[PDB]
Design brief:
heterodimer; A: 171 residues; 6-stranded mixed sheet; 6 strands; elongated; B: 199 residues; Nuclear Transport Factor 2, Chain: A; 7-stranded mixed sheet
């Protein structure tokens, strides 16, 4: 499996598992990371259904707002795809990271991720037929490496790459 | 008590020059009639193109086309149902030919498009004088009229398309280029075929 696809698939799984488990997803954003903040990275660019959001916490709150035997809100990832838009990402990186890892090692890469699926409101946790209303969602992320983690042998795809940009759409 | 998120109008933060609107207008105008000309204009060696299918519609053209493409390619053997397809700079031209004939609406109709876009940092600098360069992400949600003429197949496609725009190489046609093109085809609903009578 491709290194990018693995990171992508895994991030996707975590993210939507966290949303469906009613857990905060702010951690996955570059805003809460200390290294990037120390390096002087802008806050993550989050856009929900056309509304610009200031912080991932606000987005996490919106996710709670939306939730107000049947599950209130559930996300079903139908598909996703990831591209590499920087092979040589060096921002906020220690010096060692640049010399040890090459662009062909599939670690120092800025990724453009797109995810598309459905959104079932007031439906059975396992049924895709019965629902109050069904939306179609299409997410778009820009993922950056987490320099603090790629040193640690232990691996969470959740931390392994961080969100710098987010575009949520649902209709 | 559930209530879906609020659906605001599409905010196009393409700055003061409105480059996104121009690019999109030109791109789809070209995509419809002579898409291949887009490649020398906006595409590069570093460019990458993907097509994904979010759902398995009955007898849709794109699936069959992409299937034939994947089967035809000597480069690998996958089997029956393909969810996605990925190609580098060298096979984009060969893939765009196989894709169905499409007719998109004008951007004047805001009711038909959901275009979100913004500029982000830390892209690569093709000129190589600076470490970083700034890029423009353009996520487009919309629909169009998709058609296969060889078969008698005609219908309406709902889709999402993500463009990653960045600064171009020296001696390029335009000041910018497409770094990544991610196409997602949600659904295909059959529609009546247009007919022309002559005498």
């Amino acid at each position: 499996m491709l290194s990018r696809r693995y990171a992508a698939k895994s991030f996707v799984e975590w993210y939507y598992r966290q949303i469906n488990e009613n857990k905060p997803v702010a951690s996955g954003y570059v805003n809460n990371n200390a290294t990037y903040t120390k390096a002087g990275h802008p806050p993550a660019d989050i856009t929900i259904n056309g509304r610009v959001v200031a912080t991932p916490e606000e987005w996490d709150t919106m996710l709670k707002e939306q939730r107000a035997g049947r599950k209130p809100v559930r996300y079903d990832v139908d598909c996703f795809d990831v591209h590499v838009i920087n092979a040589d990402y060096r921002f906020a990186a220690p010096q060692r990271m640049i010399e040890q890892h090459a662009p062909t090692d599939g670690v120092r890469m800025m990724m453009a991720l797109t995810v598309s699926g459905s959104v079932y409101f007031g439906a059975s946790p396992r049924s895709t037929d019965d629902y109050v209303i069904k939306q179609h969602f299409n997410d778009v992320f820009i993922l950056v490496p987490n320099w603090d983690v790629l040193e640690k042998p232990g691996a969470r795809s959740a931390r392994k790459y961080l969100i710098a940009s987010h575009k949520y759409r649902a209709y | 008590m559930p209530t879906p998120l609020p659906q605001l109008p599409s905010n196009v933060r393409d700055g003061e020059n409105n480059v996104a609107s121009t690019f999109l207008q030109a791109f789809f105008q070209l995509w419809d009639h002579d898409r291949l000309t887009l490649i020398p204009q906006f595409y590069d060696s570093e460019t990458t193109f993907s097509v994904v299918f979010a759902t398995d519609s009955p007898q849709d053209p794109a699936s069959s086309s992409c299937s034939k493409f994947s089967r035809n390619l000597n480069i690998l053997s996958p089997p029956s149902t393909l969810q996605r397809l990925f190609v580098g700079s060298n096979l984009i031209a060969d893939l765009w030919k196989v894709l169905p004939a499409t007719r998109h609406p004008s951007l004047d109709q805001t009711s038909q498009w959901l275009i979100d876009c913004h500029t982000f940092p830390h892209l690569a600098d093709p000129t190589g004088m600076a470490p970083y360069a700034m890029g423009l992400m353009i996520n487009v949600n919309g629909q169009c009229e998709e058609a296969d003429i060889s078969q008698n197949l005609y219908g309406t496609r709902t889709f999402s398309r993500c463009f990653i725009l960045g600064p171009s190489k020296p001696g390029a046609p335009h000041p910018y280029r497409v770094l990544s093109d991610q196409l997602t085809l949600h659904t295909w609903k059959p529609q009546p075929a247009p007919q022309v009578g002559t005498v």
